[PDB]
Amino acid sequence: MQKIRRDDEVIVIAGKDKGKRGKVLKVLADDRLVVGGVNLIKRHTKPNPMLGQQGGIVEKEAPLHVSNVAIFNTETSKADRVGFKVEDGKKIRVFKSTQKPVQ
Amino acid sequence: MKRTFQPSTLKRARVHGFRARMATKNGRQVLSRRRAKGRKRLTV
Amino acid sequence: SRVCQVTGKGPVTGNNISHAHNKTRRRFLPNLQHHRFWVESEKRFVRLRVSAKGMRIIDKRGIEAVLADLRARGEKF
Amino acid sequence: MNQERVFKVLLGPHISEKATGLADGKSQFVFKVATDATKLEIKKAVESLFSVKVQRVTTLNVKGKTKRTARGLGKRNDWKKAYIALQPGQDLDF
Amino acid sequence: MKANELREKSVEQLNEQLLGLLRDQFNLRMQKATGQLGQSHLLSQVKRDIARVKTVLNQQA
RNA sequence: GGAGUCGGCAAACAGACUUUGAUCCGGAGAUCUCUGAAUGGGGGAACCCACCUAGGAUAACCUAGGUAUCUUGUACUGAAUCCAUAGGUGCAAGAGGCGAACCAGGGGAACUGAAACAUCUAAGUACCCUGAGGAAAAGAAAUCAACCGAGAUUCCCUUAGUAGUGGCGAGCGAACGGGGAUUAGCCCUUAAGCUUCAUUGAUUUUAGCGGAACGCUCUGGAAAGUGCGGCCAUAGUGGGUGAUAGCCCCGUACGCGAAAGGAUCUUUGAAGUGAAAUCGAGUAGGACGGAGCACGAGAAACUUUGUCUGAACAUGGGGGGACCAUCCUCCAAGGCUAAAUACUACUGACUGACCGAUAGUGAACCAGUACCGUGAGGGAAAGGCGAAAAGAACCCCGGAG
RNA sequence: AACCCACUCCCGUUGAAAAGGUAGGGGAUGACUUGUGGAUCGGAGUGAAAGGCUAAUCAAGCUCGGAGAUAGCUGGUUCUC
RNA sequence: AGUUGAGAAGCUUGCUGGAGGUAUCAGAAGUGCGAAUGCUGACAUGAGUAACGACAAUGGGUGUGAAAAACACCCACGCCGAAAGACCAAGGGUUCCUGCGCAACGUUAAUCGACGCAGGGUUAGUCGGUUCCUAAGGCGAGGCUGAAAAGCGUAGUCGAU
Ligand SMILES: [Mg+2]
Ligand SMILES: [Mg+2]
Ligand SMILES: [Mg+2]
Ligand SMILES: [Mg+2]
Ligand SMILES: [Mg+2]
Ligand SMILES: [Mg+2]
Ligand SMILES: [Mg+2]
Ligand SMILES: [Mg+2]
Ligand SMILES: [Mg+2]
Ligand SMILES: [Mg+2]
Ligand SMILES: [Mg+2]
Ligand SMILES: [Mg+2]
Ligand SMILES: [Mg+2]
Ligand SMILES: [Mg+2]
Ligand SMILES: [Mg+2]
Ligand SMILES: [Mg+2]
Ligand SMILES: [Mg+2]
Ligand SMILES: [Mg+2]
Ligand SMILES: [Mg+2]
Ligand SMILES: [Mg+2]
Ligand SMILES: [Mg+2]
Ligand SMILES: [Mg+2]
Ligand SMILES: [Mg+2]
Ligand SMILES: [Mg+2]
Ligand SMILES: [Mg+2]
Ligand SMILES: [Mg+2]
Ligand SMILES: [Mg+2]
Ligand SMILES: [Mg+2]
Ligand SMILES: [Mg+2]
Ligand SMILES: [Mg+2]
Ligand SMILES: [Mg+2]
Ligand SMILES: [Mg+2]
Ligand SMILES: [Mg+2]
Ligand SMILES: [Mg+2]
Ligand SMILES: [Mg+2]
Ligand SMILES: [Mg+2]
Ligand SMILES: [Mg+2]
Ligand SMILES: [Mg+2]
Ligand SMILES: [Mg+2]
Ligand SMILES: [Mg+2]
Ligand SMILES: [Mg+2]
Ligand SMILES: [Mg+2]
Ligand SMILES: [Mg+2]
Ligand SMILES: [Mg+2]
Ligand SMILES: [Mg+2]
Ligand SMILES: [Mg+2]
Ligand SMILES: [Mg+2]
Ligand SMILES: [Mg+2]
Ligand SMILES: [Mg+2]
Ligand SMILES: [Mg+2]
Ligand SMILES: [Mg+2]
Ligand SMILES: [Mg+2]
Ligand SMILES: [Mg+2]
Ligand SMILES: [Mg+2]
Ligand SMILES: [Mg+2]
Ligand SMILES: [Mg+2]
Ligand SMILES: [Mg+2]
Ligand SMILES: [Mg+2]
Ligand SMILES: [Mg+2]
Ligand SMILES: [Mg+2]
Ligand SMILES: [Mg+2]
Ligand SMILES: [Mg+2]
Ligand SMILES: [Mg+2]
Ligand SMILES: [Mg+2]
Ligand SMILES: [Mg+2]
Ligand SMILES: [Mg+2]
Ligand SMILES: [Mg+2]
Ligand SMILES: [Mg+2]
Ligand SMILES: [Mg+2]
Ligand SMILES: [Mg+2]
Ligand SMILES: [Mg+2]
Ligand SMILES: [Mg+2]
Ligand SMILES: [Mg+2]
Ligand SMILES: [Mg+2]
Ligand SMILES: [Mg+2]
Ligand SMILES: [Mg+2]
Ligand SMILES: [Mg+2]
Ligand SMILES: [Mg+2]
Ligand SMILES: [Mg+2]
Ligand SMILES: [Mg+2]
Ligand SMILES: [Mg+2]
Ligand SMILES: [Mg+2]
Ligand SMILES: [Mg+2]
Ligand SMILES: [Mg+2]
Ligand SMILES: [Mg+2]
Ligand SMILES: [Mg+2]
Ligand SMILES: [Mg+2]
Ligand SMILES: [Mg+2]
Ligand SMILES: [Mg+2]
Ligand SMILES: [Mg+2]
Ligand SMILES: [Mg+2]
Ligand SMILES: [Mg+2]
Ligand SMILES: [Mg+2]
């Protein structure tokens, strides 16, 4: 089971945005994630009149590696690793420091 | 000047064709020796 | 081919040695002829390509018994 | 012919400027059909589905154009065509 | 069209179920030829429906 | 299982799929065009033309089955010819083709060496052909030894480059006897064993599950790196994350897991086989021509056979390197038998004082491809932006270059 | 004349062409010329016979194997004192 | 670039480069290249030289175009006409037509093209095949022969020219 899921609450560790918070938007393959509000780029695309039209300069996020973010423990307010807890009938993700469920 | 290769598809299929190699065991080993090299053509 | 029906003898190979001891390949062939044998329990002649040594066996063991051996081993004479 | 084959013989109308001229001046329609469709099958299928009275069908086989690319020489699919002649006045609408 | 719902019928009214899809598969190809098709996914979906009916139609014996 | 997905080059634009469980992974099942042993008949492979039966239409057909040859058994029938033999039909079961090496046979070179060359060597090699199996073959003394004894076959080390053999030239080359790997014998007054089912249990295999421990500071685009202090260990020289990570991620040590298929070892019921009937006759021995034995006719014993002959019956027969006498030791002309042994086209795991794009496979890339040849056949070149496309909006010269 | 052939000169020889061209030349109802399909081949085929031809290769084709044949013969053999 | 040794060589630094290197002493070599008419790529000299492929032959006007000796049209010249015209077979396989193009191909330029891209185009009871029949020849149930592969051949069934 994935430790970092979609629509999570994470925090950036390592990278230029080290210390920012956001929510996971897209979980790309080959271990890359799109986290809202971090790693912003500007893309310049020719608005050629051929084949309709196109945009100019755009702002959008750029995927960063999956090992550069961690779950935010919003009780101690710091990055924590996670584990998988014994099942009543199903696995649940829990924090390593406090052994408490994450949602 | 007349050159050596004067094409014809009927005389091509009756000498080098698939059904001409499968008639004799000496031509059946040409096919096996070509299926082992990995050829894509394998027959004229 | 040149194989005795009742004994299975077939051609073999060997050498010719000249006085200077030159060796060349050769073959030894069985001495086999066609011959009709009277079969009493069938009232007709049966023709076989048997060797001369195969006739000595037929004379000794009989012909009805020899034909039985050929029948068992799938010989169509 | 089994009713399963009835729907598997016609593939669609053929769109061209020559087909549009025939559909007006001679009441003749051009279709794309299966490569193993005989003239008898096409005649029965057009009447069965479209509810018309076809009078004659001709047929021709079209080769696949061969195109050149950096990785070799690829070619398209051979297909079949049929000119279907209807009665003097009626439309082969869908 | 789940195969569970398909086993609730009989061969007599499954064969008309297969004929109903042949209309639908044909009509969608007539629209595609003229270019006035908007529901492009329906081509690949109808193909799967016929294959499933023919699957169950083989299990009755 | 647990949330994304509609394979890649290869990106884009639409249509969609779903926590009422998708894509994905494993077991089983269904469908499985045409050609190819190709098998209804032909044929220039991927094409052409049919027949019979059952069912369905009414027009110019549809659906499902079958129809090659040969071998074996069986039922019917029936030529010269009276009877029956050959033959002709219909049924059942089996074979056919492919595959790198290994195995047992059939046929079988030459270059070369001898500083020439014939006998000899290379060599029973290369090559061609035929069968079988996961192994094959050989196997239970008509064997050796030497008057003391051993005890089926197969493989390894010695004996030993020794005794022999050889235009006694170049060369070829044992055995006896020792040390080991393996352990096993049983039948023709019918056995061990081997198959195929039906059972009694166990173990593996085809997917997966959990899996411990790091904070602060400096340089820097980015910290894993500097400095300071901790924690985990049956897990510390694994891979990669924006530079060098036991504690960031995937893993690792270590424990768990199979609706259902495959395999193995297991007890006991059955059927079949072993299987040749009754201890071995055209057999042992002999003459001529060959082959094999380390042994090339040599004092040349022994095995085998193309031609021709040809015994005795346990007070009998074979062998002990010409031959004879005496002693010793075995019982041929009927069979079955595991392990130790050979190989790897194929799959998995780990490793390397192996290569790092003229190297390593011919081939890191859409390579047995492009290209060359009528064909068999021959056979290339060609890797790297950046951490992330953020791959250069907009203006000017220029042919809307 | 067409068609088949190739006696002379010159050009061309890195050619327009790995055997031609322009001028003349021989046969042109025959032992003639030609299309299509078929048969014979490597110590073998075929030859009105030149050892000629058998896919631009012939006093023994091409291809892959024995094979890295053999070479008392040429050539080459890499840093320092 | 400077410097140190008798030599193969060593060391210290400036610039480029952007992630790996290996002191000392031992251990293994695919361990040192100017030659082999050596092998593979790249690049020189000849040299801006020979040649631009039948010596039927071209001259103006207009148009398009960034740009016309070569493109399209018009007037006027030349050449073939038992072909240098038209049509079948073999062989080839989209070279056919239209719209948009000029990087490369065209022995020069190109607005043109048998060139690039994308669409379109081949309609049969009588034409040519297939189905029917056979020639040379091929294969060939049984059969005869042959170490094995296999050879020949009967019934038969393929094979047009
Ligand atoms: Mg021929
Ligand atoms: Mg070719
Ligand atoms: Mg010899
Ligand atoms: Mg037609
Ligand atoms: Mg295709
Ligand atoms: Mg078939
Ligand atoms: Mg056939
Ligand atoms: Mg057939
Ligand atoms: Mg077989
Ligand atoms: Mg032999
Ligand atoms: Mg020799
Ligand atoms: Mg020597
Ligand atoms: Mg010599
Ligand atoms: Mg010598
Ligand atoms: Mg000599
Ligand atoms: Mg020899
Ligand atoms: Mg087997
Ligand atoms: Mg055995
Ligand atoms: Mg015995
Ligand atoms: Mg022994
Ligand atoms: Mg004793
Ligand atoms: Mg001498
Ligand atoms: Mg896990
Ligand atoms: Mg962990
Ligand atoms: Mg690490
Ligand atoms: Mg950290
Ligand atoms: Mg038996
Ligand atoms: Mg006996
Ligand atoms: Mg005995
Ligand atoms: Mg004897
Ligand atoms: Mg004798
Ligand atoms: Mg002898
Ligand atoms: Mg001898
Ligand atoms: Mg001597
Ligand atoms: Mg004898
Ligand atoms: Mg004896
Ligand atoms: Mg003796
Ligand atoms: Mg045995
Ligand atoms: Mg390479
Ligand atoms: Mg490099
Ligand atoms: Mg290469
Ligand atoms: Mg001519
Ligand atoms: Mg001549
Ligand atoms: Mg002359
Ligand atoms: Mg003159
Ligand atoms: Mg003349
Ligand atoms: Mg002349
Ligand atoms: Mg005259
Ligand atoms: Mg004359
Ligand atoms: Mg003629
Ligand atoms: Mg021949
Ligand atoms: Mg000759
Ligand atoms: Mg020649
Ligand atoms: Mg020769
Ligand atoms: Mg010779
Ligand atoms: Mg050649
Ligand atoms: Mg050649
Ligand atoms: Mg050599
Ligand atoms: Mg050799
Ligand atoms: Mg030298
Ligand atoms: Mg770096
Ligand atoms: Mg590194
Ligand atoms: Mg070192
Ligand atoms: Mg070297
Ligand atoms: Mg050099
Ligand atoms: Mg030198
Ligand atoms: Mg050189
Ligand atoms: Mg030179
Ligand atoms: Mg120059
Ligand atoms: Mg000059
Ligand atoms: Mg000059
Ligand atoms: Mg000049
Ligand atoms: Mg000129
Ligand atoms: Mg010229
Ligand atoms: Mg020209
Ligand atoms: Mg002009
Ligand atoms: Mg002008
Ligand atoms: Mg001109
Ligand atoms: Mg004139
Ligand atoms: Mg054609
Ligand atoms: Mg083209
Ligand atoms: Mg054109
Ligand atoms: Mg144009
Ligand atoms: Mg230009
Ligand atoms: Mg140009
Ligand atoms: Mg074109
Ligand atoms: Mg016919
Ligand atoms: Mg005939
Ligand atoms: Mg024949
Ligand atoms: Mg036969
Ligand atoms: Mg016929
Ligand atoms: Mg015919
Ligand atoms: Mg004809």
Per DSSP, helices labelled H in chain D are 3-6, 17-25, 39-50
Residues 6+ apart with CB under 8 A from C41: C64
Q: How many CA within 13 A on the CB side of residue A63?
A: 12
Give the three-state DSSP class for A91. Answer: coil
Interface test mutation site (partner E, options D1, D3, D4, D7, max chain E beta carbons within 10 A): D7
Give the three-state DSSP class for E6. Answer: helix
The dihedral over CA atoms of A67, A71, A72, A73, expressed in degrees to the nearest 10, equals: -130
As given in the structure block, the two tokens for residue D9 are: 């013989």
Q: Is D9 exposed, middle or buried (0-12, 13-18, 19+ CB in 10 A)?
A: buried
Residue with tokens 């025939």: D22
Strand F-proximal residues of A, range 40-99, CB below 7 A, are 41-47, 56-57, 62-68, 70, 79, 81-84, 91, 96-97
Distance C6 CA to ligand 27 centre (A): 20
Distance D67 CA to ligand 82 centre (A): 18
Residue with tokens 């609450």: A9
As given in the structure block, the two tokens for residue D46 are: 């057009």
Nucleotide nearest to D15 (CA to C1'): H120
**Contact indicator for C70, C55 with CB cutoff of 8 Å:** no
As given in the structure block, the two tokens for residue A44 are: 């310049």
What was the experiment behind these coordinates? Answer: cryo-EM
* Contact exists between C and D (3 or more beta carbon pairs < 8 Å): no
Alpha carbon of residue B28 to chain centroid: 11
**Contact indicator for A22, A37 with CB cutoff of 8 Å:** yes
* Beta-ladder partners of D12: D32
Distance B12 CA to ligand 1 centre (A): 9
**Domain extents in chain B:** 1-44
The three-point CA angle E50-E52-E57 to 5° equals: 95
CA D31 vs CA D4, D64, D92: distances in Å: 19, 17, 11
Contact call for D7 and E22, based on CB within 8 A? yes
Interface test mutation site (partner D, options E16, E22, E26, max chain D beta carbons within 10 A): E26
C18 touches strand F (CB under 7 A): no
For D:20-39, CB contacts with E below 8 A are 32
The three-point CA angle C43-C47-C50 to 5° equals: 130
* Chain D residue with minimum CA distance to E27: D94
**Contact indicator for C45, C36 with CB cutoff of 8 Å:** yes
Pick from D7, D12, D94: CB nearest E25? D7
Among residues D14, D52, D8, which one has the least CA distance to residue E23? D8
Residues 6+ apart with CB under 8 A from A48: A54
**Resolution, expressed in angstroms to one decimal:** 2.9
The C-alpha atoms of residue E61 and residue E53 are separated, in whole angstroms, by 14
First-to-final CA distance of chain C: 13
Write the single-letter amino acid at A88.
Answer: D
Alpha carbon of residue B32 to chain centroid: 13
Maximum distance among all alpha carbons in chain D? 52
Assign domain B1-44 to its CATH architecture. Orthogonal Bundle (1.10)
Q: Is C38 left (phi over 0), alpha (psi -120 to 50) or beta?
A: beta
**Contact indicator for C11, C30 with CB cutoff of 8 Å:** yes
Total count of residues recorded for chain B: 44
The three-point CA angle A64-A70-A74 to 5° equals: 135
> What beta strand segments (E) does chain D contain?
10-13, 28-33, 56-62, 66-69, 72-75, 79-85
Q: Distance (Å) from CA C13 to C1' F291? A: 9
The secondary structure of residue D63, as a DSSP letter, is: P
The secondary structure of residue D64, as a DSSP letter, is: P
The C-alpha atoms of residue E26 and residue D12 are separated, in whole angstroms, by 9
Among residues D61, D64, D55, D63, which one has the least CA distance to residue D84? D55
Give the three-state DSSP class for C37. Answer: strand
**Based on C-alpha coordinates, what's the Rg of chain C?**
17
The C-alpha atoms of residue C8 and residue C76 are separated, in whole angstroms, by 14
The C-alpha atoms of residue C32 and residue C50 are separated, in whole angstroms, by 5
The C-alpha atoms of residue E16 and residue D92 are separated, in whole angstroms, by 27
> What beta strand segments (E) does chain A contain?
10-12, 21-22, 24-28, 32-35, 40-44, 57-61, 64-65, 69-73, 78-80, 82-85, 92-95
D93 touches chain E (CB under 8 A): no
